[PDB]
Amino acid sequence: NWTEIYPGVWKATVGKPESYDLLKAAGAQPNKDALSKTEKVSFPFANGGVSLEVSGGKTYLRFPLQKEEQLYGFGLNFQTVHQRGKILELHVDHYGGKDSGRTHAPTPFYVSSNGYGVFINSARYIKVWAGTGVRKDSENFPTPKDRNTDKTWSSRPYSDAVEILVPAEGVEVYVFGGPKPIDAVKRYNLLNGGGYLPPRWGLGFTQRVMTRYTDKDVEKEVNDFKEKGYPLDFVGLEPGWQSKAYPGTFSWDKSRYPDPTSFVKKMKDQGIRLNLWINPYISPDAPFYKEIKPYTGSHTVWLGLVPDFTMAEARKPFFNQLLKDQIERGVSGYKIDEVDGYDYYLWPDAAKFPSGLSAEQMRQTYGLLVQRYSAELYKQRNERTFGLVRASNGGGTSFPYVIYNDYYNHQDFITALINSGFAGVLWTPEVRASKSGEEWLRRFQSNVFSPMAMINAWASGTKPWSYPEVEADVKKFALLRMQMMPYWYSAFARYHFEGMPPFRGMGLESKEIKDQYMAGDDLLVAPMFAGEKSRKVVLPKGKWYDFYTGEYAGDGEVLDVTPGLDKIPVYVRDGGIVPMMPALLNSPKSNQKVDLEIRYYGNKPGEFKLYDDDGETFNYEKGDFSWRTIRVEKDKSGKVKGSISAAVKGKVNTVGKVTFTAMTK
Amino acid sequence: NWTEIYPGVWKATVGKPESYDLLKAAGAQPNKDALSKTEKVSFPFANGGVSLEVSGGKTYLRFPLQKEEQLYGFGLNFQTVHQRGKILELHVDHYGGKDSGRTHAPTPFYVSSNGYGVFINSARYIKVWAGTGVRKDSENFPTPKDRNTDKTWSSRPYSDAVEILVPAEGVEVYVFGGPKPIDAVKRYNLLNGGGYLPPRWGLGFTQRVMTRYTDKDVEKEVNDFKEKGYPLDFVGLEPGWQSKAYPGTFSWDKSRYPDPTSFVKKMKDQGIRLNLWINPYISPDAPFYKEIKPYTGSHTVWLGLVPDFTMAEARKPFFNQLLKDQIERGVSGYKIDEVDGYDYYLWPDAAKFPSGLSAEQMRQTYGLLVQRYSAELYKQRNERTFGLVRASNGGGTSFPYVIYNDYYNHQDFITALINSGFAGVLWTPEVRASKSGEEWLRRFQSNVFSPMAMINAWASGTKPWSYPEVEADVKKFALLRMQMMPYWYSAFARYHFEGMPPFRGMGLESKEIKDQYMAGDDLLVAPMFAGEKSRKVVLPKGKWYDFYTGEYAGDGEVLDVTPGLDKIPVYVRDGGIVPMMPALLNSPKSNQKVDLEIRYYGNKPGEFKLYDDDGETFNYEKGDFSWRTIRVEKDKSGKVKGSISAAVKGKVNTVGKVTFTAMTK
Structure with a gap:
């Protein structure tokens, strides 16, 4: 049975799970508080098609797929991002030059474009058929065709399910709701305790x-x-x-x-x-x-x-x-x-x-x-x-x-x-x-x-x-x-407190993008590789601005960019904000105030939550931290107008002078 | 316990074997008669080091290796012949471009250069570490070295055992004695019933x-x-x-x-x-x-x-x-x-x-x-x-x-x-x-x-x-x-009756030979590949003769050969005999006599056993077959002298006129 154990998180115990598994190995404690503040969404498999069986020493899992659906995850893959139609054996290893499931972190967690995720909590090697099996009893069993005469015959007919095999007499499974893919990832990460808050x-x-x-x-x-x-x-x-x-x-x-x-x-x-x-x-x-x-x-x-x-x-x-x-x-x-x-x-x-x-x-x-x-x-x-x-x-x-x-x-x-x-x-x-x-x-x-x-x-x-x-x-x-640093620190604070991965793929606000990523909430990064003079950048809908000059770049379109050697292509969402400290050679100490220049891009009114604490101890666990809300806009004249919320009485405050810059002239 | 079930064949049952396995799947009957005529050799692991354990749902097998020892087999590999130091998961599959254990016939049988073989009779996927594990309790545990200071430090230290893991609560294991590697292969094949006798x-x-x-x-x-x-x-x-x-x-x-x-x-x-x-x-x-x-x-x-x-x-x-x-x-x-x-x-x-x-x-x-x-x-x-x-x-x-x-x-x-x-x-x-x-x-x-x-x-x-x-x-x-045809038919008869593979590697009468094979008993074949004008041929000790001209080629040495487009390099052992029928366009029928030219190479007196039967039914099972012994020599003058043993009363006889040719002038 599926127990809703937190908002958007369901747990099922199939057969007899082993007494050692990934969560127990890690000693991972859920961040209950962060989880309880997520939306209480409905169970992502609402129309059946789920099967959880134990047979012949193994646990057989099946989760339905719809026609539209793309899949992501199954760990730290190096050459593929879309995972539907893939077959893997998840197995810790140094990466071997192909995405087989052998990799440094073969996380048995996948996310769907329809806005859910599934985690298989076993420390065994796990086999995955991510929509390749074609079942005779399937509700979507394609009509057999005669290859001798029919040009439309397919060597890989439509598959309607993710199938997983665990070599054990049972397993714990977790399902994460959405509504968006990133929601499922955040809940998964919070179940794990959230990201570490780095120094x-x-x-x-x-x-x-x-x-x-x-x-x-x-x-x-x-x-x-x-x-x-x-x-x-x-x-x-x-x-x-x-x-x-x-x-x-x-x-x-x-x-x-x-x-x-x-x-x-x-x-x-x-x-x-x-x-x-x-x-x-x-x-x-x-x-x-x-x-x-x-x-x-x-x-x-x-x-x-x-x-x-x-x-x-x-x-x-x-x-x-x-x-x-x-x-x-x-x-x-x-x-x-x-x-x-x-x-x-x-x-x-x-x-x-x-x-x-x-x-x-x-x-x-x-x-x-x-x-x-x-x-x-x-x-x-x-x-x-x-x-x-x-x-x-x-x-x-x-x-x-x-x-x-x-x-x-x-x-x-x-x-x-x-x-x-x-x-x-x-x-x-x-x-x-x-x-x-x-x-x-x-x-x-x-x-x-x-x-x-x-x-x-x-x-x-x-x-x-x-x-x-x-x-x-x-x-x-x-x-x-x-x-x-303040930009990255705040992104990492979101990873810890909300489970938001600081680096992630596109479309996580139909074809595979393997060479652009979001870095924090505000930046789209599109690396150049040696030997290239230009590259295409796919921009999501909404306006984007050049990270360096602040100039309008585009909106929901493909750009051809020749950045030169001195720039990595980076684009900032409309209203995006990057707080910048001085070019210090060493990270600032906890007793040190640091000035910030708030670089604000575009014209949409912007909002940024700046994390602040001592940057080195676990005092934050006792509540010695703050989020300072920064808001920035252009006034009637086109002149920048910015505010930062007030320092909180009793808390660490490392924020010095704050100035605002409208990057988009 | 190891039961000697036939001469040079031992069987052990470890834990609780599954009721389905390879031999049962195949319905394979041992050729008891052929097996009883093999030499009663001693058990190949005479000095211990063998371990057969069941634990945590699996069967763990360990067989010792000596320093000199090379290993062959583990199925139909395409890029490797020496198997020591290899790691495999034996798994039926179309070959994928690397020797991983995924192949068309991933036979869980290996042979050692010391003259024995081991067959693991399980129809599961099987994992093999063929001398890569280094055990702390080993009798040959190398002395730890400091990589910081010692130039002789090894990234792959000496391993003294073959380790196999079978995912089941027990397994049947077979061990085949020698004295030669080919002996172990023959006994294995006879245990399987011998090769098919083709039409x-x-x-x-x-x-x-x-x-x-x-x-x-x-x-x-x-x-x-x-x-x-x-x-x-x-x-x-x-x-x-x-x-x-x-x-x-x-x-x-x-x-x-x-x-x-x-x-x-x-x-x-x-x-x-x-x-x-x-x-x-x-x-x-x-x-x-x-x-x-x-x-x-x-x-x-x-x-x-x-x-x-x-x-x-x-x-x-x-x-x-x-x-x-x-x-x-x-x-x-x-x-x-x-x-x-x-x-x-x-x-x-x-x-x-x-x-x-x-x-x-x-x-x-x-x-x-x-x-x-x-x-x-x-x-x-x-x-x-x-x-x-x-x-x-x-x-x-x-x-x-x-x-x-x-x-x-x-x-x-x-x-x-x-x-x-x-x-x-x-x-x-x-x-x-x-x-x-x-x-x-x-x-x-x-x-x-x-x-x-x-x-x-x-x-x-x-x-x-x-x-x-x-x-x-x-x-x-x-x-x-x-x-x-008569040459190949006789070779295939040896496969059926004696378990002798008709095509096999060198050294089966210290470095890997991947591009020469024996074809029947008498021929060493060394293929040319497109784009090559010449190649090296490694000849075993003993004299060899050119298949085409009969001229002396060498003895226990490496040749550089430029054969031309019209020849594949083929060499015949000293005294080797190839019976040749006419260049018929269709195989001869059972009621048909066929002339033979016996091509005899070198000067060592030669002996060849020619198989003969109807070539198409199972009448041979009832004893309607013959082996005709052919012997050929050169007399004092250097003139060819040959004999063929007499046809056997009551048996099929398809042998017509027999002439002899000394190929080595």
Whole structure:
């Protein structure tokens, strides 16, 4: 039976569900308050066609489709956005170059253009036929045709249902109502706890440095950023911070980092946090090796033991070491690597774990487990974190981690950014290296319109300025990222409080758009790729304005755009507002006031909700935050008129002088 | 426990095996007599390391590997022959362009270079890690290394075991002893019943004609073959013989084939058999539709019902129709198409079948079922058949079918031919079309050194003579195929009686050879591909002789060969013998004597066992067959000296005048 458990959210338990699943793995708590404020819409399957059966050891699910209907989601796909007519096996893995279901976050959640969603809460590998099955007993069974004589014969006849097979004796299913597709995604994300509310520093620039860097190499690089006037908030350390890697000791190397306490402190005194690479695979020389060994799996990954993080006995030594040796020294967060695949690196499905959890469910949830328990260490200290993880799944919306990978096709990197919005996870299209300055800049441009502005120079040793032909423009985009901080912070606040993904596909206010995305509420981003001089941009109905000049761009039409090397095509909705702080090189501290220039586009009266709090603790959970409403219009003369609501008594206020600019002359 | 059930064959039952599996699906009877004559070798795993466990709904199998060891098999792979270090999910499908385990015959049987084999008798999809898992408790656990400092660090450390996961509560496992790899394959094949003993006509030439051909178009084509002096034994009809296709009526079309009885008879009177295309998917206009409908699956394939051939109630109407409407008219056999995939054509794993058999086991065994029951119709009439099928599996060695597909990479076509020898199935690299005469001839050359000499002109309308630049050479190869009939027939007799695959890889008397195969006992075939003028040939130790001129070629060495367009590189072992009949255009009838020229190569004294029987019935089962031993040598002078053993009283004797030729001058 379908229980309406929240407004627009229904739960069904089919057969006998397993005692481990995605939500339980994640320890994900629904945001009940946010959910209760959503509209109480009706059940999206109102005309039958739903079937939930257990048979022969498996759970068979069927959901009807209508002729008009398109589907989105099924996780972090890289080459496809429309999912109807697709066949997948959802399976955590490093992306393999095709959308098979093998990917870093194979979220078993899909959304329909008719305005609903469905989440299958199983930590098993799941098979999906998204409208390919043609049932003899179907109400829409097409009329058989004779291929010998009939030109209209079809090799893929009409299918009227999504079919899912779960290899278990039952499953929990969740259905999310609309009325719009984005409504279903928001409710799904709120069921997961909402997005994490990141620290402001997490939205600044991060440079990861070569594996070999010593503490002195890092200090010099920090100094070079400062000297050249490039922003930087956190530095990523790669495997050479550890005394051994692959497998790891999770202790600082004595030669390269002889005094970690002093090193972390110095960086912090200069405004610089550190984010440490780990994979979770245990060296014999790790200090907690002997203690953890019985609570590890049968199989190793690069000769490291694999902790069973479902066991307290594995968690305690592992996470105590991170806590005592790094977090308590000031380390801001982690890059949780190599928790996805490939199959020939990670443990086989044939492996055994001491808790008795199947290796399959462990593969599906390992990234969730390491995200969960690492994040808790920070939350216990009233400190936000923000980091990187190479695997996640359903249940992982609330974690402070962004997905990245070693794939590099730029176009597909943007497609994954789109799909991240359907998958309850964050994705960054990171910058590593490039064969040209052109490509470097194009990549850097799209990267600063994403969750995390980052160069990963683990092997390349690149810095933002490494391509002289484009360095002046790279600097400009790096500074823009800082200036847009209040815009991004407010978008991320919406993700946390309302489940609104900050990056998402078009049409989420009939043909597939794989190369444009909305960034926050106000910006349509249409990346250029190396070797292109122009591109088409599909604009939704309503007027849009050029992000750079404020000039009218179009309304419900296709544009041909030749932006030049120095611009990424970005368009602002009519009445859209981007609050801009100064081009600071470091995120502003909680006790700091920052001036804002409110850039207002078009002529429709605009409204923007600016989020404000200390930007670094969990004090917001106790109500120490504010939303400042900004409204902007042009008066009779065409002169800008703006207001900002009053600061709230007793709350953090980081808003300084506020000025308004009508961008559309 | 391991029961030695035959010499060199051990069976273990782990947990609770399912009541349906590959051997039962196939109805495969062991050839006990042939098996009892094999050597009683010892159990190949003599030093432990074997583990067979049931846990969490699944069966976990582990078999040890030694450092030296290479592995072969895991079915009909197209790009790989060495299988150690591979990860697969064995799953019937049309080949998808990579060796993932998805293929037409994903036989769960592997062979080791140390001289044993292992068969997993499950009709489920099976996962295989062929030496990739690295167990912490392993006796060969490599010493962890620090990737930060150690240049010898390995991204894929040494693995000492084959691990297999079967999704069921138990499984039957078979282990085959050696001493040689080929011994394990022979015992496996004999356990399956041995290969089918084909009719001689099955080894002649077959032309499949365009979908649209009428009975008159076929008669004309038959006449053109005769007029141009090209051999032909059987003609393949494509979907236009049926009154409707996709889905099918399994009844002759009234417009294109108005008088089937008369048509089949006429062709037969001219020496020409017919082989009919089917897929097994049922049209509403099929005469047995209403009867069969309740015994079909939930899902359709191209809008045709899918019979549950595990049910007598489905088998009876389906096979009665083939029997009465076609076989009883004289139709020689079938092309069983589209029983493999892709997933978006065939029924989903989510489908249900009336017998309660899982859709998964049905997918794995459908080709086996249609092979089994079609073949029985012929055997009941004391008539051999020989045809084509697009899917098979373990258990299918004894069936009279050859695998083909719509893939076309020529190199990979040869690799599949090699792997067929490890997989208990037959494969033909068919000829369809070509962009050049060069390619046409190269393909035709390799095709006449295979199980079935065939052009499939369903779409291309090609005939052997369609490329004028090479037509004279094509004709020569077509006639060679006929001349080599006694050679091929004897090789196929060894497949039936001894389990010896007629086509197989090298080293089956340390690096991968993917482009040479043994064809019968005596011939090493090394195909040329279009665009190549020369190639390397790796010759085993022992002397080899050029197939065409008889000249010494080499011994245990690599040759660089520039054969020209008119030759496929073929080498004959020292003392090797190829019996050649005349260049007949049609296979000889059972009451017919045929002269033989015994072509003897090298100088080592040679011995050849020539199989002889009626070539068309199952009378051989009652002992009406002979092996004639042929021995050939050069005397003191260097002059050829040959003998053939005496015809056996009471047995068929089709051997006419026998002459001997020393090819090596």
